[PDB]
Design a binder for this molecule. Sequence first.
Ligand SMILES: *[C@@H]1O[C@H](CO)[C@@H](O)[C@H](O)[C@H]1NC(C)=O
Ligand SMILES: [Ca+2]
Ligand SMILES: [Ca+2]
Ligand SMILES: [Ca+2]
Ligand SMILES: [Ca+2]
Lengths: 145, 121
Amino acid sequence: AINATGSAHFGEGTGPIWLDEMKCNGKESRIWQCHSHGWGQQNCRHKEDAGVICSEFMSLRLTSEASREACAGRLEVFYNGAWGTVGKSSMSETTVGVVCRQLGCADKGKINPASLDKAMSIPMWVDNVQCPKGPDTLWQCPSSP
Amino acid sequence: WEKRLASPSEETWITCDNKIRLQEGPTSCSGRVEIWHGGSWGTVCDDSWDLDDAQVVCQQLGCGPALKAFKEAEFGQGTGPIWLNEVKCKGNESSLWDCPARRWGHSECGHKEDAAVNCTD
Ligand SMILES: *[C@@H]1O[C@H](CO)[C@@H](O)[C@H](O)[C@H]1NC(C)=O
Ligand SMILES: [Ca+2]
Ligand SMILES: [Ca+2]
Ligand SMILES: [Ca+2]
Ligand SMILES: [Ca+2]
């Protein structure tokens, strides 16, 4: 885990609250093995709903000087709570196709050289990405670790 | 009954007890916020309990500026009904009754979320 959010950060659920006041050592694999007050032993409301942000959760966005997210600029990946760029080398046309379709900009795109300046420096995350034909998102495209 | 003018000394001027108080705190100027309405005392929930709201409560009682506004019933579990919710004071209001909130409405907030305010002397 990276974050452990609360107060319905991701939204308010509708089903009956099952567990409450959870303390856990972290060794057991299943959530049910942690100490709990019982089943239905809740005194909260739907405004209080737990949420997490795990390490493997990732997102993609094209940063630009004009706006934080846009349809042009430099694409960035977000791994284990940290941001970073993507290696340019070995980037096929279909690779840019998945990036643009995932962000909802256009069916196809093209690679252009860097702009006049960079807003900030971030450590490069991944390189040598080769998207096949058929995947809709970049997370299903094999690449280097 | 008699109709007769008299000096201001014979005239009555009364001053009821204050509607807003802080209780259970270690000091006099700090504690859980307790308000009086409908003939009984009560608490105020911590939803959107900002430091600006705490400033109004300290000003109403007369204590100093509020350094910190807490939540989740730090000092103790409240006793009585819950009156206000989602109260948003801009800081310029003289009384908590001027600020808009869930005015004497049923509060979805439980009794574990009673607010608390710590002011300085
Ligand atoms: C997650 O935790 C990190 C590290 O403390 C923090 O920078 C970030 O704002 C947190 N995100 C959320 C949504 O709480
Ligand atoms: Ca725990
Ligand atoms: Ca609880
Ligand atoms: Ca709350
Ligand atoms: Ca407020």
